[PDB]
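Page 47, continued from p. 46.
Same chain as before, 96 aa.
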Amino acid sequence: GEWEEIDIGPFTQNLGKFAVDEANKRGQYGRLTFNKVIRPCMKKTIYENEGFREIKGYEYQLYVIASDKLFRADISEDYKTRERKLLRFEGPVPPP
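Result:
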């Protein structure tokens, strides 16, 4: 399986902040205030399909508490540029 649990240290918390910033732009929940990312944070690596199967990027699934509510965010991150995209941000979700 290509998903693996990663740490919820500062880089992951900053991913959650990105997710909340992007969720605020989408506005589905109105303005939210990032609180923290909780376990589990899952990452999967996306590879090119052919050639050297270079890593194309990553996808993360995060559980982020924002405005005291728990959301699940899916975030892509390009390997070469570090460009992140919020793919999904939903909740309030059950605690994982």
